Design a protein around this ligand. Sequence first.
Ligand SMILES: *C/C=C(C)/C=C/C=C(C)/C=C/C1=C(C)CCCC1(C)C
Length: 137
Amino acid sequence: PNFSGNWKIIRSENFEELLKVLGVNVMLRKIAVAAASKQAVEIKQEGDTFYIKVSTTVYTTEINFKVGEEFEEQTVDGRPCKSLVKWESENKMVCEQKLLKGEGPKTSWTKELTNDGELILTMTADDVVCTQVFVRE
Ligand SMILES: *C/C=C(C)/C=C/C=C(C)/C=C/C1=C(C)CCCC1(C)C
């Protein structure tokens, strides 16, 4: 359905704990938590092809993928990874990531459109799950 839209964050939970698992030191975690509270997500969806632009005050990144086809992006802490997205249901998809180089926590993400019109993003590193909730602009 309708992932397409301009989304603004209303809630961000456990993001600091996620970055801590990923090795980010305390001062940068605090500043990253602050940046995340200004997160905006623009999505264009055509069938199972997605164009996604995630931005904060000073940074913007574009994620392009097709469900079921491997692509390359970065982990939350900025390491290059190979990613693969699959549907889990009508309006939820799940992305598994694999580091291109080296070792690290096992990371993934999910994107879900709820019946109440919220977009829920989850980001995971090992046992720690960050949940972010967005509404349409
Ligand atoms: C479908 C939506 C997706 C896959 C959103 C991904 C979002 C990110 C990779 C956000 C990353 C951020 C940081 C790594 C620190 C700066 C603040 C964020 C939350 C924009």
